[PDB]
């Protein structure tokens, strides 16, 4: 389930060090480059005022883009803790310099279990992204396509009544997921698998 989540992100630009956590007990930071030279870089990070440490940088191709990443161990991926991050060239010029609270960089799985059913308005219902805790804190957003109306939902909801719909039109639905709380932020998940439904006579 990894590659996609990264590929999703890297469209967030090369000026920011892309970083996310999967179960708040991990951290992965990556950045893509070009393949013409590879380059020598030093990933240094500090947690609080503990001594700075170094992170082993690994290389990989994507096709012909090359991606450098580095994983952070579970003990020093506590939440609510300012964790600094520093990618530096062997020349010494800093390439990124970030401050992430690890609680703030979550990337959730796609929600599963989406169904729809109707005379009146339509009831969508679905399941929170599987094998992710804190299911009572998820944010979801749906997308009524036919042409693109997005209905926004908030903490802990797994259904919706699609008021103000149409008739004699094919409709497609989907729901994404993200953590949303005062101490919970991150990027939107990938869209759930879509469910289709044809409206009644009008």
């Amino acid at each position: 389930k990894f590659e996609s989540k990264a590929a999703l992100l890297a469209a967030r630009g090369p000026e920011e060090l892309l970083c996310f956590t999967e179960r708040l007990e991990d951290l992965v930071c990556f950045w893509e480059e070009a393949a013409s030279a590879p380059g020598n870089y030093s990933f240094s990070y500090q947690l609080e005022d503990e001594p700075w440490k170094l992170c082993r940088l690994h290389q990989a191709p994507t096709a012909g883009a090359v991606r450098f990443w580095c994983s952070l161990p579970t003990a020093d991926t506590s939440s609510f803790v300012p964790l600094e991050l520093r990618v530096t060239a062997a020349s010494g010029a800093p390439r990124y310099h970030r401050v992430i609270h690890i609680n703030e960089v979550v990337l959730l799985d796609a929600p599963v279990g989406l169904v729809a059913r109707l005379s009146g308005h339509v009831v969508l219902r679905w399941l929170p992204p599987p094998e992710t805790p804190m299911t009572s804190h998820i944010r979801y957003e749906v997308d009524v396509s036919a042409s693109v109306q997005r209905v926004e939902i908030l903490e802990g909801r797994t259904e919706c009544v699609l008021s103000n719909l149409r008739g004699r039109t094919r409709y497609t639905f989907a729901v994404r997921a993200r953590m949303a709380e005062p101490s919970f932020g991150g990027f939107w998940s990938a869209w759930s698998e879509p469910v289709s439904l044809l409206t009644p006579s009008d």
Partner: antibody
Amino acid sequence: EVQLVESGGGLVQPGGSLRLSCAASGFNLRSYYMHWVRQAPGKGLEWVASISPYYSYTYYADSVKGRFTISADTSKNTAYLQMNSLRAEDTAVYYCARHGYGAMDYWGQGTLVTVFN
Amino acid sequence: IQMTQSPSSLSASVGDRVTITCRASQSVSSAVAWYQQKPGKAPKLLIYSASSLYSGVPSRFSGSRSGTDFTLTISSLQPEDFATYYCQQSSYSLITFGQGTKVEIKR
């Protein structure tokens, strides 16, 4: 346990030289960012230089480049700021700090550089 | 990267709520810190990561971010709070401080 102690400040004629020392007790210096910051008398704070852990990468402020050089002796657990071509404007109290929490958490008491004619 | 504090000084009474603002120019990360300096003493850290209270700093001190405006707020001034205050920003290689804010007593 952490304590930063500085030395080497004093009076200096313009163009002369001083080497400041900053002795760090309570942590290893090779594993921390160290900063020199100076405070002109009755003026604000002005960052001067930095050195990075494990690679001793020096970074300076344009108002200090070339004339100052920041350095560290890992064995002595001490960071040094050499100031050459001193100017009347460099008269200030110079502090050494330690990077922590995204900022400078532990500060020395500071040492006074006076540039007199 | 230019950090501009306002006001440069203000006078308030004990128990007053006082808000200091710090204006960043270039795309500024949230690596902003707040410092206290009393006459002759070294700077003392109060806030880091723009909102987190340094261990031992009283609850009166708070930090917030509103885009390019970073604020330090003291909820209710106590006599040991009247000092000079600095905001600090670290960007990639450069570290800048605000021009400094002097908090004085209204009497």
